Amino acid sequence: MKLLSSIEQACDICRLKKLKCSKEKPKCAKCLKNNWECRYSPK
Numbered sequence: 001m002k003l004l005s006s007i008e009q010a011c012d013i014c015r016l017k018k019l020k021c022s023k024e025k026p027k028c029a030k031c032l033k034n035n036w037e038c039r040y041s042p043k
């Protein structure tokens with residue numbers, strides 16, 4: 001019973017665009033604003 005998620009929080013959309021990610025959930029302010037697919041969970 002230890003650890004499940006990653007350890008560097010930041011959605012896909014912030015990767016590509018090079019954006020800041022307050023990390024609001026599910027989608028940051030970013031994706032919500034542009035209707036995007038905020039996925040901060042790779043594979």
Ligand SMILES: [Cd+2]
Pocket residue numbers: 010011013014020021022023028030031
């Ligand atoms: Cd983000």
Ligand SMILES: [Cd+2]
Pocket residue numbers: 011012013014027028030031037038039
């Ligand atoms: Cd996002």
